[PDB]
Design a binder for these strands. Structure first.
Lengths: 57, 57
DNA sequence: TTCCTATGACTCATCCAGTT
DNA sequence: AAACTGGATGAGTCATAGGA
């Protein structure tokens, strides 16, 4: 192992934990986009229900 | 002396430029929708507070 | 066989952070 | 210390999977 050799198999792992970590950062941004659409589904229905027992505007 | 292989890299290297613009744009694309959706749903939460005050809970 | 791209993995040159 | 020690980012290149 030169310090370049040591260094390379170690950088190679820090490039790794980051692809793994970059995978998670988008799988979550998919979920915050999911739940927000389930919340807009239930919320505009809720409005149409209380809307009905009063007026249309 | 030359480029057999310098054509295979200058093309693979375009392809990695390309594959990486896609991931860049699905990521900014979803994040705008997290801001957008967020915004619709506060307005709707307010309209629901209001119609449950016009009428009730 | 043979060719060709799209994506994972590894290397390189930076650059940044903690730490004393 | 804008230079120790070692991790971490961006972009080219390598190894492979899939496609035709």
């Amino acid at each position: 192992k030169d310090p370049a050799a040591l260094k390379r198999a170690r950088n190679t792992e820090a490039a790794r934990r980051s692809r793994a970590r970059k995978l998670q950062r988008m799988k979550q941004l998919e979920d915050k986009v999911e739940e927000l659409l389930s919340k807009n589904y239930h919320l505009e229905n809720e409005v149409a229900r209380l809307k009905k027992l009063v007026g249309e505007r």
